[PDB]
Amino acid sequence: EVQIHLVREVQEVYRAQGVSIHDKHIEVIVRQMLRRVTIIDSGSTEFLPGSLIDRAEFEAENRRVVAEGGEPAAGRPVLMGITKASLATDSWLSAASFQETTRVLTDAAINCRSDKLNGLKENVIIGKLIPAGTGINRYRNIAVQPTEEARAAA
Amino acid sequence: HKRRLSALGPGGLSRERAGLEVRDVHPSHYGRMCPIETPEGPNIGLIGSLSVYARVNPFGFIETPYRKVVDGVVSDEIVYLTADEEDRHVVAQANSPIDADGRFVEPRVLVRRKAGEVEYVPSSEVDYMDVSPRQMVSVATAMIPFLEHDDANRALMGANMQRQAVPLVRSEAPLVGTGMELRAAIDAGDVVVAEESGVIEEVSADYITVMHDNGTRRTYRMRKFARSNHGTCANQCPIVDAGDRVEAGQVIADGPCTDDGEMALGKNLLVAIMPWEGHNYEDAIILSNRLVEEDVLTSIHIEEHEIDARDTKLGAEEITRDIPNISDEVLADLDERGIVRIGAEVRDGDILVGKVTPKGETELTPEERLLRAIFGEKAREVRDTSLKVPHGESGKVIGIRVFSREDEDELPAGVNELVRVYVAQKRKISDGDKLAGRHGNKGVIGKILPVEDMPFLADGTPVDIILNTHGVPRRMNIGQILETHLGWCAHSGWKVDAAKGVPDWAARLPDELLEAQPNAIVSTPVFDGAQEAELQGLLSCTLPNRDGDVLVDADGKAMLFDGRSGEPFPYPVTVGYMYIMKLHHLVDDKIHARSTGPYSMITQQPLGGKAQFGGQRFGEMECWAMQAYGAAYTLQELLTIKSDDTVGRVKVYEAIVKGENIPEPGIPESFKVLLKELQSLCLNVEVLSS
Amino acid sequence: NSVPGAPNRVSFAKLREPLEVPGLLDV
Amino acid sequence: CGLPKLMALELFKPFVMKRLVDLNHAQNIKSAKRMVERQRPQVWDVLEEVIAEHPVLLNRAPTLHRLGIQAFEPMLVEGKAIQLHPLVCEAFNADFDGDQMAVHLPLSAEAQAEARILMLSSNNILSPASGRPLAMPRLDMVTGLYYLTTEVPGDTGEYQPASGDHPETGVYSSPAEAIMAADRGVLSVRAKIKVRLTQLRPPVEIEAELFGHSGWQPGDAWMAETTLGRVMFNELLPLGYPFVNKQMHKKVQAAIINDLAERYPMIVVAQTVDKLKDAGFYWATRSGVTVSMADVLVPPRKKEILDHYEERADKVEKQFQRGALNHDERNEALVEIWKEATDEVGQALREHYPDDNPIITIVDSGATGNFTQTRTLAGMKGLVTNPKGEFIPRPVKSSFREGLTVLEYFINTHGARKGLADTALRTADSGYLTRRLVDVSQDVIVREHDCQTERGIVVELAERAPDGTLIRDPYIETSAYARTLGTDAVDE
Amino acid sequence: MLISQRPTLSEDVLTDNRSQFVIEPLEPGFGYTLGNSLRRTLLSSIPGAAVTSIRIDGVLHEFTTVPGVKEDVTEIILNLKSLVVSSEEDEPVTMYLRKQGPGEVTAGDIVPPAGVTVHNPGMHIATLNDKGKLEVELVVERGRGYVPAVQNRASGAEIGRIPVDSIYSPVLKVTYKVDATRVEQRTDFDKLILDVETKNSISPRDALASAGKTLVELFGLARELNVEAEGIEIGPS
Amino acid sequence: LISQRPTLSEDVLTDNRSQFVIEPLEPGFGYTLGNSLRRTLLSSIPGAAVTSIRIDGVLHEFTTVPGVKEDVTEIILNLKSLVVSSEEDEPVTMYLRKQGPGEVTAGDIVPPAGVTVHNPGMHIATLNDKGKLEVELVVERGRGYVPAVQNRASGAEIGRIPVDSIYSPVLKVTYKVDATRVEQRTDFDKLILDVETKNSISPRDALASAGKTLVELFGLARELN
Amino acid sequence: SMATGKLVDIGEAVGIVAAQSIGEPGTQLTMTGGLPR
Amino acid sequence: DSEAVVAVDAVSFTLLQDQLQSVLDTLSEREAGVVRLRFGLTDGQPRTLDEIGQVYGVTRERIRQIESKTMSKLRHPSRSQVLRDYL
Amino acid sequence: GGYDTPLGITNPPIDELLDRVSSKYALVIYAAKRARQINDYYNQLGEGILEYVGPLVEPGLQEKPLSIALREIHADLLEHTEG
Ligand SMILES: [Mg+2]
Incomplete structure (x- = not known):
């Protein structure tokens, strides 16, 4: 319901200025808003109540933890703001440049949180070939040879 | 720039901390600070100018003249009122009908209340009337005819560009103007004014000896070809003859942008308003080749270069012809000591000041040792840094000013000889130059057409420039159209019929206007100008040129012939004369390019700026866009081996010159700097593959 | 008007103003 | 893209140095560089050879979206300015008032490939946002084609079917014959005639009526009553496309180009749009659209409307002077009365103008400008805002052709300067919001073909009437299109 | 130079x-x-030569109805206008297009007098339904450029003749x-x-x-x- | 027909x-x-027009001459409107000397045999008691418009002042x-x-x-x- | 894919396309009923 | 950075080395070895007349004569127009 | 098919080029690696032989190798496997 509401609400403003935008863009944005869930009951597997973790990680660790430690944590769907979603990032280098860079960096060093270089932001910063467009491994590793018939003919 | 008001600086508010409300226009600005003229950048409202009639209170306020009106009778006691005592009272306007004895004939009169309110006052309570119209407006904005027909946006753009005209080599006066071009030019400073009434003794191109009426004589040294603060010329030609008698307060020598005393910021050109071939698409402007042929738009640009002789540890800097490794043919134009001589045409990258520095001794590479062994050349230990003229700048060399420490000139510390070279060139008009009329209608030059392929008039006169129709109605600035009609009327010359007396449209039109010679100068005041009846009726009677040739109808249009195809256009086209300008946003002052030039010092990025070769900031949204295509390799190219791959740049240049594959992009410098700083900040940064 | 070296530029001034433009660099 | 030769001479300098080392014009690279500085005129030929088939990038700052960067084929042109193709000005948002553009240059073969294939002009035609094209014709050429395809009865050489002793005397056997009879001064272009067409595809009614299976235009011959201009117009469109026979509004042209892009390959569409640009300019020349102040006609009974609503406002303000109603209610009544008068004057202006008035012609074509700008040209400005945001109850009663008063123009300054400052603040804050959106959505790419779920949203999709008549929902093109049905659809 | x-x-x-x-x-x-x-x-x-004016038997004033044909009169007119023929005489020479019975009329069915020459004889013009008979007399002269249909200055001779355009x-x-x-x-x-x-x-x-x-x-x-x-x-x- | x-x-x-x-x-x-x-x-x-001049008193384009009322670029703009017709394609040279006070017309220019100036009444400059004017001119047959050729494109010294030519x-x-x-x-x-x-x-x-x-x-x- | 007209590929950064498509007409957003909304 | 890599001088010095090796290989083997060991062009160390006469088993005088003859052979504008352009 | 001839940078048409590969990105890296093979061929003609095949169709007078690569892709003389 809140997705259907938000799409209609923002699209209404773009209607009011007479600008046609396809809805799937707003769908992509709201999908990023509704990634994380809160915790109100810890279960029994390293959970603080009120913590915001990803939904898919939560569901996967629950389907692992139902055997041998079967206390599923009570999760609730939460709507977090765009800046709030940005600050709830994956890597320290992925954040690194938004808000209280010092406070990000200090507990980044405390947690010793290693990056995996999966976004494009970090790969831009280190100048690596980013995993997008021409950059993913399906297109990066294309073997190229002529056809053998034309190879023999020429 | 004089008479300019600013709200930013020390003491006052800053730019970004200031809100939106002080940018706006309170009604107390009326008559004091002009609500039109302001920069349109990120300074809107913060920088205005004074009104024409404004004057500063000894208490630092802005006083304002008013004709006080008593008992309905307008007196002539001019009263300088300030803002608070304005709100005490209530003020009528300039367009108030007088019975030639002061008194208003309207019982209900426009008036301004203290809070900016406008009412129809019963015509007894008014104690002040305006001294004139245009009391609200600035100086430069009061040089726009038909201001009252233009919207404030394009009027703001036109008035802001009107300070950006360049001086032509001719400086021809406009046909159509205001009453401000004489007074503003005699207050401009750059017009030599005859101080004391007398008679001319002897003139020159450099001085006028005036013979005063009682005894004394006085010269006035003309400034010829002086460089201004932006490369523009400052010629001052005299305009009187030897037997002439002059008076005090009279113009005796025109300045840069003046003609016969009054202002002249451009030329008068035959213009048509048709859309032609897509070359005048979206404010693009086409020209005739005749503007190139007759140098109608041509400015003289004067650029001053500079180099110093300086002390050092290894010796002293030396300015001489001894400039190791070099032909003798490129050392032809310079004198016996390295500097060029007056009048030598230079290109880009030549030698201006032959000057060499001591370098000392390093080891020689053995290949260089072999080559110097073969050719019998010495080491020639001194290193040459001569003053080379930078890219795309050429022309004559007018003047050399040279300073010397040994010649007891004042110099900065450690400096031995300072020489400056005045380089000058005469730029033509060119496609890309920024032109604008006096209404905000601006634009680059689309295409300089030849003189034959042009929509030309039935007499064989070609039009000069051609604007666009589509940019006119949506920008709400039809003052250019009224200027066009009035310009054709003034160019052609008229004489209305008085056989049945005055025609009814020309009743309020005052006398010595019923006739006009062709090419006669006219002036519309700003808010008291030609009305629709006057302009159209005067356009009706517009006497022919050489034969019986009523070229332009009563509507203001004319039948043009296509210079390209040859058939007539099927519809009559609006033509006439508009006074336009050339602006200082020229192409050579903006063209900028670099393959390999200077880098930075701290970072390994290429250095930027047109003073250098300079680079282009591939910014953030650019990175966003190339991520959005997904062109990842080209993004890697732009981020690495054009910016900071120090070992990569030389190998890419080498692989291009060998004609080979472009190698793999290495690790950029800006990442390694971040890595070293994080290691310096007591953080063990680890890099792992598995 | 009323400047001894002014060229004869003709006006459309319907209203005759009393006050002249001051010495603009007084500020 | 056109390109200044002295700029490209510096950009492509290692390329031209390598190539004139390959040709025997220099012993090394050093004398090659010196010759590049001395510009020996064979170097321009070598520069042509190295610029031949090597794409470059172009960018207008700021980069608002993906089409802010495009790749064009350079070509050496006289002058010192960058010649831009006019149909990408909508993508760059680049008017020619002096805005500069930045040129880059790819180096590696991968970079040349990415520039040639991805960021090329011909491959990026539609919106990335909402699928509508941006190479679509505009300001001038829209007016050109609108004049070229409009239909004017009462014209010279117009068809009549009536036959006295004479025949009907209107038909023409070939469009070539029509061109000859139009170059002679008999036929006007916008006159209605009856040609016999042999190279154009008839519409689905006529095509299915005559030939049923395929009214295939390479061989077939058929007649129609149109104008000459629309026949020449459909000559620009490709062979497979049917005849249009409408008056080319910009919306019509948008629908046409959408149709072409959804049916035909892209390189056909690029050529079609180029040919439309040429024809649109060529008939924007002959359109005769000029602006004279004699063509800014005023409505004659404007003054009595002003008298009407002035007496109404006089009664309202006199009632406020009685003190029976307060300051706010009388101000709101003044606002409503002068808005009524504004719409009255705009109504009278709209009915007064003939259609060949160029000012109303540009608007009704849909090139640029709404009707309110025309109304404020001729008629009445109406309400000008308070600097706070309210309305000034005076209001301006004059047009720009009439010329405002001192006070009216002073009132107009408030809203003008407020709009400028608001525009600066809006473009800065819109940049900031674009920052935040890139901050969020930077990690959402496609990684798999299909997740193969069966969940999914529903779309309203052209709701019915109370009668049951399925009226099309207006917001389907933004919602329902470019989607994949996760479920089937069955019909009762 | x-x-x-x-x-x-x-x-x-x-x-x-x-x-x-x-x-x-x-x-x-x-x-x-x-x-x-x-x-x-x-x-x-x-x-170059073109057809100046034709005349058709049976056609009276209605200019739409010809007996025995599938085709309309104006279609026959525009077929005749797109008919290439060269002529070597500076004078209006007349011809005869005649065919009886049902079937298809081609351009080659016409009989050329001296000077005139059909350059596309396999051009279709007309079809006759069932035992119809056609007799059309064509007037071909030569000239330059383009000319519209000449008006009815020649009127009394044009009681059967009707003028057409002529692409010269x-x-x-x-x-x-x-x-x-x-x-x-x-x-x-x-x-x-x-x-x-x-x-x-x-x-x-x-x-x-x-x-x-x-x-x-x-x-x-x-x-x-x-x-x-x-x-x-x-x-x- | x-x-x-x-x-x-x-x-x-x-x-x-x-x-x-x-x-x-x-x-x-x-x-x-x-x-x-x-x-x-x-x-x-x-046609035929003037191409390059040389004045002994000056060395470049952007200066003055002692004695005259105008300056060098104004002299260029005045001489640019002359009319002249040659007969042969070689570059001929005409001359002009003037001393003392007085007005200088176009008619005072003496040409060599073959070429001729057709507007003698055209003003060029005016002089005073200190006025000393000497100027040579170069005329050549040509066609169309042409910009001023550069002095480095020539082999000439400092004295030559190239002018645009309008044939x-x-x-x-x-x-x-x-x-x-x-x-x-x-x-x-x-x-x-x-x-x-x-x-x-x-x-x-x-x-x-x-x-x-x-x-x-x-x-x-x-x-x- | 809204610009190709065919199906989207397996490498498109649809997030940045969406971000620019939403952020672009903010200049045309002529105004709590506007950009801060 | 006035002490930065000009990046055209590097590839120019590379081409200098390359055509330098070509011109040195236009002559005989002993002479090219003499010049390379003399000016250190093969290692970086200029081996003097004693080392060259040691590695060729001959007097210092013969090395001086051979080196003077190589200087005579190099001094052809035919051989050395490309070398003259390098400085 | 029969529409028009292209010219210059747009020849071969990508509307035909996409008929051969899966998506456009494969066409990009495919053409790029083929162009690197052709540049490796042109560099190695100075030295000895190797099996680096190329070019296959006739090149131009002075034609860019990426153009030759795309033209050979259009002529279907080449093949590939994805990553
Ligand atoms: Mg702009």
Whole structure:
């Protein structure tokens, strides 16, 4: 319901200025808003109540933890703001440049949180070939040879 | 720039901390600070100018003249009122009908209340009337005819560009103007004014000896070809003859942008308003080749270069012809000591000041040792840094000013000889130059057409420039159209019929206007100008040129012939004369390019700026866009081996010159700097593959 | 008007103003 | 893209140095560089050879979206300015008032490939946002084609079917014959005639009526009553496309180009749009659209409307002077009365103008400008805002052709300067919001073909009437299109 | 003067009567000077014959109804207008298009008198339903350019005769454009590209030559004032 | 077809301008022929103009001369409007010396044999008691517009001041047609053409050279066939 | 994919396309009913 | 950075080395070895007359004569127009 | 099919080029690696032989190798496997 509401609400403003935008863009944005869930009951597997973790990680660790430690944590769907979603990032280098860079960096060093270089932001910063467009491994590793018939003919 | 008001600086508010409300226009600005003229950048409202009639209170306020009106009778006691005592009272306007004895004939009169309110006052309570119209407006904005027909946006753009005209080599006066071009030019400073009434003794191109009426004589040294603060010329030609008698307060020598005393910021050109071939698409402007042929738009640009002789540890800097490794043919134009001589045409990258520095001794590479062994050349230990003229700048060399420490000139510390070279060139008009009329209608030059392929008039006169129709109605600035009609009327010359007396449209039109010679100068005041009846009726009677040739109808249009195809256009086209300008946003002052030039010092990025070769900031949204295509390799190219791959740049240049594959992009410098700083900040940064 | 070296530029001034433009660099 | 030769001479300098080392014009690279500085005129030929088939990038700052960067084929042109193709000005948002553009240059073969294939002009035609094209014709050429395809009865050489002793005397056997009879001064272009067409595809009614299976235009011959201009117009469109026979509004042209892009390959569409640009300019020349102040006609009974609503406002303000109603209610009544008068004057202006008035012609074509700008040209400005945001109850009663008063123009300054400052603040804050959106959505790419779920949203999709008549929902093109049905659809 | 560069003429040959002529290079800008005049010469200077007016038996005033045919009168008219025939006499010569019985009428079914020649005899004109008989008399003379239908000045003779249009030019569609070839070393020269499409009467190769002959005989009038006036020659071929 | 080959007759109005009428023509042709001759006459008639000057008192373009009222660039702008007609293609050199007070006209310039200035009344400069004027000029046959050639493109010294050259003997060209076009199809055009030359060569001599140029051009196409 | 007209590929950064498509007409957003909304 | 890599001088010095090796290989083997060991062009260390006469088993005088003859052979503008352009 | 001829940078048409590969990105890296093979061929003609095949179709007078690569892709003389 809140997705259907938000799409209609923002699209209404773009209607009011007479600008046609396809809805799937707003769908992509709201999908990023509704990634994380809160915790109100810890279960029994390293959970603080009120913590915001990803939904898919939560569901996967629950389907692992139902055997041998079967206390599923009570999760609730939460709507977090765009800046709030940005600050709830994956890597320290992925954040690194938004808000209280010092406070990000200090507990980044405390947690010793290693990056995996999966976004494009970090790969831009280190100048690596980013995993997008021409950059993913399906297109990066294309073997190229002529056809053998034309190879023999020429 | 004089008479300019600013709200930013020390003491006052800053730019970004200031809100939106002080940018706006309170009604107390009326008559004091002009609500039109302001920069349109990120300074809107913060920088205005004074009104024409404004004057500063000894208490630092802005006083304002008013004709006080008593008992309905307008007196002539001019009263300088300030803002608070304005709100005490209530003020009528300039367009108030007088019975030639002061008194208003309207019982209900426009008036301004203290809070900016406008009412129809019963015509007894008014104690002040305006001294004139245009009391609200600035100086430069009061040089726009038909201001009252233009919207404030394009009027703001036109008035802001009107300070950006360049001086032509001719400086021809406009046909159509205001009453401000004489007074503003005699207050401009750059017009030599005859101080004391007398008679001319002897003139020159450099001085006028005036013979005063009682005894004394006085010269006035003309400034010829002086460089201004932006490369523009400052010629001052005299305009009187030897037997002439002059008076005090009279113009005796025109300045840069003046003609016969009054202002002249451009030329008068035959213009048509048709859309032609897509070359005048979206404010693009086409020209005739005749503007190139007759140098109608041509400015003289004067650029001053500079180099110093300086002390050092290894010796002293030396300015001489001894400039190791070099032909003798490129050392032809310079004198016996390295500097060029007056009048030598230079290109880009030549030698201006032959000057060499001591370098000392390093080891020689053995290949260089072999080559110097073969050719019998010495080491020639001194290193040459001569003053080379930078890219795309050429022309004559007018003047050399040279300073010397040994010649007891004042110099900065450690400096031995300072020489400056005045380089000058005469730029033509060119496609890309920024032109604008006096209404905000601006634009680059689309295409300089030849003189034959042009929509030309039935007499064989070609039009000069051609604007666009589509940019006119949506920008709400039809003052250019009224200027066009009035310009054709003034160019052609008229004489209305008085056989049945005055025609009814020309009743309020005052006398010595019923006739006009062709090419006669006219002036519309700003808010008291030609009305629709006057302009159209005067356009009706517009006497022919050489034969019986009523070229332009009563509507203001004319039948043009296509210079390209040859058939007539099927519809009559609006033509006439508009006074336009050339602006200082020229192409050579903006063209900028670099393959390999200077880098930075701290970072390994290429250095930027047109003073250098300079680079282009591939910014953030650019990175966003190339991520959005997904062109990842080209993004890697732009981020690495054009910016900071120090070992990569030389190998890419080498692989291009060998004609080979472009190698793999290495690790950029800006990442390694971040890595070293994080290691310096007591953080063990680890890099792992598995 | 009323400047001894002014060229004869003709006006459309319907209203005759009393006050002249001051010495603009007084500020 | 056109390109200044002295700029490209510096950009492509290692390329031209390598190539004139390959040709025997220099012993090394050093004398090659010196010759590049001395510009020996064979170097321009070598520069042509190295610029031949090597794409470059172009960018207008700021980069608002993906089409802010495009790749064009350079070509050496006289002058010192960058010649831009006019149909990408909508993508760059680049008017020619002096805005500069930045040129880059790819180096590696991968970079040349990415520039040639991805960021090329011909491959990026539609919106990335909402699928509508941006190479679509505009300001001038829209007016050109609108004049070229409009239909004017009462014209010279117009068809009549009536036959006295004479025949009907209107038909023409070939469009070539029509061109000859139009170059002679008999036929006007916008006159209605009856040609016999042999190279154009008839519409689905006529095509299915005559030939049923395929009214295939390479061989077939058929007649129609149109104008000459629309026949020449459909000559620009490709062979497979049917005849249009409408008056080319910009919306019509948008629908046409959408149709072409959804049916035909892209390189056909690029050529079609180029040919439309040429024809649109060529008939924007002959359109005769000029602006004279004699063509800014005023409505004659404007003054009595002003008298009407002035007496109404006089009664309202006199009632406020009685003190029976307060300051706010009388101000709101003044606002409503002068808005009524504004719409009255705009109504009278709209009915007064003939259609060949160029000012109303540009608007009704849909090139640029709404009707309110025309109304404020001729008629009445109406309400000008308070600097706070309210309305000034005076209001301006004059047009720009009439010329405002001192006070009216002073009132107009408030809203003008407020709009400028608001525009600066809006473009800065819109940049900031674009920052935040890139901050969020930077990690959402496609990684798999299909997740193969069966969940999914529903779309309203052209709701019915109370009668049951399925009226099309207006917001389907933004919602329902470019989607994949996760479920089937069955019909009762 | 010295031409400093010689313009040349190289033909490209498209489909049979649609030759494509280009001229390169040209002094800026002579492409517009000569290409438009060449186009107008191709359209309006070449002699050629066409049908001036026909007359049909049975047609009375209604001009829509012919017995025994499938076709409409105006369709027959526009078929007859698109009929190439050359004539070698400066006089209105008449013909006869006659056929009885059902079937299809071709262009080849007509009988040509002296001077006239059908250049596409396998052109369909008419079809006759069932035992109909047609007799149409055509008036063909020759001339230049284009002409509309001549009015009813000739009226009493035109009681059965009705006038039609007459395309006298052998060309049908002529269009052109310019270019800007080699702007640096040849210093902004121009290249004309022509596209002429004629009927099978004459080749466009020949039509261009005849138009060049008419234009040079035209400008001989301008040349024969001062032969000793220095123009700008081109030189050797 | 109508049977008359076109005729070209002449109409004199003044010395430096004249008219021309050409009749009969084909309908729809006169505008095209007039545009053809206009684009020819206005653009490609060979003439002769001044190219580069040298004044002993100065060394460059952007200075003054002691004694005269104007300056060097104003002298350039005045001399740019001269008219002169040569006979041969070599670069001839004329001279001008003037001393003492007085006005300097164009008529005071002495040319060598062969070349001639046609506007003696044109003002150049005026001088005083201190006035000392010496200037040489270089005139060459040429055609069309040409920008000033560079001194480094020349082999010359500092004294030469290159000027743009305008080889246009014509001044102004227009025309009009009179389309008869009766309703008897004996229809023809009547091109009344107008020439104004700037008193260098006759309008007849201009028009004949333009016609010979067109005979050359159309010649090309006409038989390279 | 809204610009290709065909199906989207397996490498498109649809997030940045969406971000620019939403953020672009903010200049045309002529105004709590606007950009801060 | 006035002490930065000009990046055209690097590839120019590379081409210098390359055509330098070509011109040195236009002559005989002993002479090219003499010049390379003399000016250190093969290692970086200029081996003097004693080392060259040691590695060739001959006097210092013969090395001086051979080196003077190589200087005579190098001094052809035919051989050395490309070398003259390098400085 | 029969629409028009292209010219210059747009020849071969990508509307035909996409008919051969899966998506456009494969066409990009495919053409790029083929162009690197062709540049490796042109560099190695100075030295000895190797099996680096190329070019296959006739090149131009002075034609860019990426153009030759795309033209050979259009002529279907080449093949590939994805990553
Ligand atoms: Mg702009």
